[PDB]
């Protein structure tokens, strides 16, 4: 993670020795994307908004996948054979605001791989941590309420990096988009409903597994798909729609929240105590 300005010779060890030890063709492509992304950050800064940690390896992954989705049955072209400029247009195309059209499996793989976050994701994760006593555990990482709530403020950039570190261990990029969506749903449930508050630690993976398992069960009732622990169907389901991904997650979060005390709140005092 180059978090601070570094020398050409330190940056070179990071690319040819410290990070890429399996394929060095990756270091040339990653060097190609830093040059392309750097001018894109300078002249078109907003093609990279909602991105705070630009994972060049993950952005290259989004590009290899875009070549496969674009490719169709015909074999996908090798990003490596593509010309420096063709690699820049692939990047510019993947960075383009995902529009109505692509499979929601492709939208998720690109957004998750680019690590794009809905606006206010970081502020919304603060609001989830403020109303959760024991913290959020995602992919074996844990944002505990303290020392973060005590040492940080809502819009602190340091927090955005802690949220990004917490979601660091999410290996699969489409899972990062579902975890980013559970967190966006948990923020709407918590904000829309001010009475509910988490008792134990929120395991974002378990809320996602529970949502997929409900989807698995409901889709099974439609047509009994026999693929198991394959979330491809779940990822393709649109976020909002008749039975979309956002329903399953809201349900899971609400079952967890409702298993705990409902604090009587004064903003809209109950008409029933």
Q: Contact 143/159 with Cβ under 8 angstroms?
A: no
Binding flag, residue 180, ligand FAR (CB under 6 A): no
What span, in angstroms and rounded, lies between the C-alpha atoms of 236 and 239? 9
Binding flag, residue 6, a copy of itself (CB under 8 A): no
Q: From the CB of 117, what's the least distance to ligand FAR, in Å?
A: 13
Pick the closer one to a copy of itself by CB: 68 or 220: 220
Phi-psi region of 32 (alpha: psi -120 to 50; beta: other; left: phi over 0): alpha
HSE at residue 154, side-chain half, CA atoms within 13 A, is 8
What span, in angstroms and rounded, lies between the C-alpha atoms of 115 and 131? 25
Binding flag, residue 199, ligand FAR (CB under 6 A): no
Binding flag, residue 211, ligand FAR (CB under 6 A): no
Pick the closer one to a copy of itself by CB: 32 or 164: 164
CA dihedral 39, 158, 137, 131 (to 10 degrees): -120
Among 8, 101, 240, 266, binds a copy of itself (CB under 8 A): 240
Map the footprint of a copy of itself across residues 191-230, applying CB under 8 A. Answer: 192-195
* CB neighbour class for 188 (10 Å; exposed up to 12, middle 13-18, buried from 19): middle
Binding flag, residue 79, ligand FAR (CB under 6 A): no
Picking from 169, 176, 172, the residue whose alpha carbon sits closest to that of residue 116 is: 176
Among 181, 203, 220, 231, binds a copy of itself (CB under 8 A): 181
Among 119, 150, 228, 273, binds ligand FAR (CB under 6 A): 273
Q: From the CB of 189, what's the least distance to ligand FAR, in Å?
A: 3
HSE at residue 251, side-chain half, CA atoms within 13 A, is 13
Pick the closer one to ligand FAR by CB: 150 or 272: 272
54 binds, among a copy of itself, ligand FAR, none (CB under 5 to 8 A by kind): none
Q: Contact 198/139 with Cβ under 8 angstroms?
A: no
The residue range among 26-34, 70-78, 187-195, 215-223 that interacts with ligand FAR, by the rule CB under 6 A, is: 187-195
Pick the closer one to a copy of itself by CB: 25 or 243: 243
The residue range among 6-14, 56-64, 115-123, 126-134 that interacts with a copy of itself, by the rule CB under 8 A, is: 115-123
Q: Contact 172/230 with Cβ under 8 angstroms?
A: no
Q: φ, ψ for residue 227 (rounded to 5)?
A: -65, 140
Q: What count of residues does the chain have? A: 273
Map the footprint of ligand FAR across residues 229-248, applying CB under 6 A. Answer: 246-247
Q: Token pair of 90, please?
A: 């692939």
# residues near a copy of itself by CB under 8 A: 40
Binding site for ligand FAR (CB under 6 A): 184-185, 188-189, 192-193, 195-196, 246-247, 250, 262, 270-273
């Amino acid at each position: 993670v180059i978090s601070n300005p570094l020398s050409p010779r330190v940056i070179q060890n990071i690319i040819y020795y410290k990070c890429n030890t399996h394929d060095e063709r990756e270091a040339v492509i990653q060097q190609e994307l830093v040059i392309h992304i750097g001018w894109i950050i300078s002249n078109n800064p907003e093609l990279f908004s909602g991105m705070l940690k630009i994972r060049i390896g993950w952005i290259i992954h989004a590009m290899e996948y875009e070549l496969q989705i674009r490719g169709g049955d015909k074999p996908a072209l090798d990003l490596y054979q593509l010309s420096p400029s063709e690699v820049k247009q692939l990047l510019l195309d993947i960075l383009q605001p995902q529009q109505n059209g692509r499979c929601w499996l492709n939208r998720r793989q690109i957004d998750g791989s680019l690590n794009r976050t809905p606006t206010g994701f970081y502020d919304r994760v603060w609001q989830i941590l403020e109303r959760t006593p024991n913290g959020i555990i995602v992919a074996g990482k844990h944002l505990p309420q303290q020392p973060t709530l005590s040492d940080m403020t809502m819009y602190e950039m340091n927090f955005s990096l802690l949220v990004e570190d917490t979601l660091g261990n999410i290996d699969q990029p489409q899972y990062r988009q579902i975890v980013v969506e559970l967190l966006m749903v948990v923020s709407i449930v918590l904000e829309r409903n001010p009475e509910l508050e988490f008792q134990d630690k929120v395991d974002l993976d378990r809320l996602v597994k529970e949502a997929f398992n409900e989807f698995q069960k409901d889709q099974s009732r439609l047509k009994e798909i026999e693929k198991q622990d394959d979330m491809t169907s779940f990822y393709n389901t649109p976020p909002l729609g008749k039975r979309g991904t956002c329903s399953y997650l809201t349900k899971a979060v609400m079952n967890l929240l409702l298993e705990g005390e409902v604090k009587p709140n004064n903003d809209d005092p109950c008409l029933i105590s």
